[PDB]
């Protein structure tokens, strides 16, 4: 099982675990984030992951075709998943653009963020050592805000288009385009290095963080719950959708990946192994992130909740501070950002390939026989690059935050998971699904999967959605910038672009099918083959 290991190990460490989980945990007060995180994990995450893999293997086709075999009425789930992937690919690559910019900035004798004597730095800067010797600002934070981002006062001020970051996105997109068109992927002896290097780097960062003088307070903030105050809907949605985002579920890529295997594989063992390990690596890297934050709190003399930004830049603020505290910081900075680029590039390759397949399968005659696939791939990459340019401007950070919060996370993932589990448990039939699983892997799902799909996942998703609507709180960048109403409307438009697919497809297929309305629904609910 050792190479299976290396394959699916490349599989479960991604920008999600390293980057998204730490800042989401930090944003929700730390310890309080973990309780809904594990509740959603064991309630829905693993069962929905297993369910999606089972669909992918059962149909032996793409994520859009399977619903035709299962439930023709709810075929809109595949379109929702493919549009979720399409929106995710646009903004997920900006992280690699920032990583590329940091890596290019790392080719210096002294790291630019280790001290503040440069041009872009504000007069209020004080060295972290000297800050406790307040209106002062840490050099790393203002480097992230002013040199890389050049952050605008708000989303209403796009500002100039940062040319260096635009070229970084262009370089990353060229790498992706060449890899997808030429089929370049980690298949030779390089797979072992690609699978082991991220874990080695994370272990080094964890060791450095835990040995910091202020690590203990960071761990206390990371693990101590705050159920008395922090039980807002926001933490529940954030943890539940972080579970669904770390796994490639509700995106429709897991069905395609599962279709690559066969019934002889040890399904429901690989699923639990990969899911538990994927959550475990996130939980482990949380210790490193929060220990670095605790060291920052000890050094700067301020609370842990105030040391760094409550946003996507937590990874780009904490880790550079960690590599600053190691011998020869340039070497560790270069290694860390090479690791980050590889870790994000592999996932981006997988997502773009899945999108390309799920779109060419809708018209193979035109997109695979009437025209070369290279042209279609170039079209997809170019359109995504022009769309991603919107997050490169000086105010691009706000757009990226909105995209992360709405386009490929939040209520849309709960919507997709609820409709998946509802359809399979109730419309298609839990007994039928268990019988199919018996036919494929040899044993029934058991009470845990079945009761999860029937009750627990629908209850959790509906409860989170209703609790969010009842106790609604608007999105805010960091914890001080309030988005305008039009930006919130745009975010909800991004979410609804995925949510509305199911009702639209239901109504369209109802209209396009002949017969009485009762007969229309009854026939469109019948499985195929």
């Amino acid at each position: 099982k050792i190479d299976f290991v290396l394959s699916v190990a490349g599989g479960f460490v991604g920008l999600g675990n390293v980057w998204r989980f730490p800042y989401l945990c930090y944003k929700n007060g730390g310890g309080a984030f973990l309780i809904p995180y594990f509740i959603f994990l064991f309630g829905s995450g693993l069962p929905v992951f297993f369910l999606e893999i089972i669909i992918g293997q059962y149909t032996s086709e793409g994520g859009i075709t399977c619903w035709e075999k299962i439930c023709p009425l709810f075929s809109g789930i595949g379109y929702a998943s493919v549009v979720i992937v399409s929106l995710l690919n646009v903004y997920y690559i900006v992280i690699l653009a920032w990583a590329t910019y940091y890596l290019f900035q790392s080719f210096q004798k002294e790291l630019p963020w280790a001290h503040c004597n440069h041009s872009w730095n504000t007069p209020h800067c004080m060295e972290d050592t000297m800050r406790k010797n307040t209106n002062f600002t840490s050099p790393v934070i203002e480097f992230w805000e002013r040199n890389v981002l050049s952050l605008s006062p708000g989303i209403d001020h796009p500002g100039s288009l940062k040319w260096d970051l635009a070229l970084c996105l262009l370089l990353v997109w060229l790498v992706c385009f060449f890899c997808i068109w030429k089929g370049v992927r980690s298949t030779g002896k390089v797979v072992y290095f690609t699978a082991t290097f991220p874990f080695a780097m994370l272990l080094v960062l964890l060791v450095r963080g835990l040995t910091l003088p202020g690590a203990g307070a960071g761990i206390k903030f990371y693990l101590y719950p705050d159920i008395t105050r922090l039980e807002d809907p926001q933490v529940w949605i954030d943890a539940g959708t972080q579970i669904f985002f770390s796994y490639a579920i509700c995106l429709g890529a897991m069905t395609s990946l599962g279709s690559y295997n066969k019934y002889h594989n040890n399904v429901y063992r690989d699923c639990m192994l990969l899911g538990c390990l994927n959550s475990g690596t996130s939980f482990v890297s949380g210790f490193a992130i929060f220990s670095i934050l605790g060291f920052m709190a000890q050094e700067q003399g301020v609370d842990i909740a105030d040391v760094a930004e409550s946003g996507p830049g937590l990874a780009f603020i904490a880790y550079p501070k960690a590599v600053t505290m190691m011998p020869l910081p340039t070497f560790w900075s270069i290694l860390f950002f090479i690791m980050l680029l590889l870790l994000g590039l592999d996932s981006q390759f997988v997502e773009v390939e899945g999108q390309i397949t799920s779109l060419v399968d809708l018209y193979p005659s035109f997109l695979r026989k009437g025209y070369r696939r290279e042209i279609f791939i170039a079209f997809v990459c170019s359109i995504s690059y022009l769309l991603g340019l919107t997050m490169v401007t000086e105010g691009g950070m706000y757009v990226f935050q909105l995209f992360d919060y709405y386009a490929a996370s939040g209520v849309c993932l709960l919507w997709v998971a609820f409709f998946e589990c509802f359809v399979i448990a109730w419309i298609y039939g839990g007994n039928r699904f268990s019988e199919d699983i018996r036919d494929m892997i040899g044993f029934p799902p058991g009470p845990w999967m079945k009761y999860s799909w029937a009750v627990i996942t629908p209850v959790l998703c509906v409860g989170c959605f209703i609790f969010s609507l009842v106790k609604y709180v608007p999105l805010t960048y960091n914890k001080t910038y309030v988005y305008p109403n039009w930006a919130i409307g745009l975010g909800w438009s991004l979410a609804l672009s995925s949510m509305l697919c199911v009702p639209l497809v239901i109504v369209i297929r109802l209209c396009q099918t002949e017969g009485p309305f009762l007969v229309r629904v009854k026939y469109l609910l019948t499985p195929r083959e």
């Epitope: 039928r432 018996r438 036919d439 040899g442 044993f443 029934p444």
Partner: antibody, heavy 118, light 107 residues
């Protein structure tokens, strides 16, 4: 998980037809797959047919695929095997076995019924 | 059809001594899809070992089994008069299902 009983065995002529029944008790018959296993007078065991829990998936041995039909009554909790053309080699002792988990084997075996051709 | 076979078709045995049996398959069976059944004379077969190592409910702890690929075996720590029965290996990996030739312990 207690009791399984076969019935319907008897003497028939070659090329005839016979229906075999297998009653189930002590467990939810609709939640477990059922399989028929055959023991020749030489005591050699041979698998015959399998029916899934809901009856949607059916498998047959290569030697009985064209002549044997397996069916179940989930409401009645009774398992039935139908033979349309009994050859000379079909004379044997028939068992109905519970095979819900392929990785665990046939948990329980019935008493069995003999079949003879003359 | 994956034909199975068992070597010691007839095995004369005496109480107390350790005994062993072997099962072989024409095709590579998964370790989780092979099972052993005991059948006393005049009685229906009973499940004995499943997943090549897991003893069934009624089998005493003296029994054991191991194997992989296309070669498998079953062993007895110390036989007894109550162990005089016929044992069949069976593969559950692919259809048609097949049973081994069977080994009957003479005592």
């Amino acid at each position: 998980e207690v009791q399984l009983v076969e019935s319907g065995g008897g003497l028939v002529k070659p090329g005839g037809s016979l229906k075999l029944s297998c009653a189930a008790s002590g467990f939810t018959f609709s939640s477990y797959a059922m399989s028929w296993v055959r023991q020749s007078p030489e005591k050699r065991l041979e698998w015959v047919a399998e029916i899934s829990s809901g009856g949607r998936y059916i498998y047959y041995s290569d030697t009985v695929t064209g002549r044997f039909t397996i069916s179940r009554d989930n409401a009645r909790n009774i398992l039935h095997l139908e033979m349309s053309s009994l050859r000379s080699e079909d004379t044997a002792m028939y068992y109905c076995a519970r095979g819900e988990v392929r990785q665990r084997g046939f948990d329980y075996w019935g008493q069995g019924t003999t079949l003879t051709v003359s | 059809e994956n034909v199975l076979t068992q070597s010691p078709a007839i095995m004369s045995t005496s109480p107390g001594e350790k005994v062993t049996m072997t099962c072989r398959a024409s095709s590579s069976v998964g370790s989780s899809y092979l099972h052993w059944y005991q059948q006393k004379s005049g009685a229906s077969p009973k499940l004995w070992i499943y997943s090549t190592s897991n003893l069934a409910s009624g089998v005493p702890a003296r029994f054991s089994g191991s194997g992989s690929g296309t070669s498998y075996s079953l062993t007895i720590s110390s036989v007894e008069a109550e162990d005089a029965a016929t044992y069949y290996c069976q593969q559950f990996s692919g259809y048609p299902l097949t049973f081994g030739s069977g080994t009957k312990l003479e005592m």
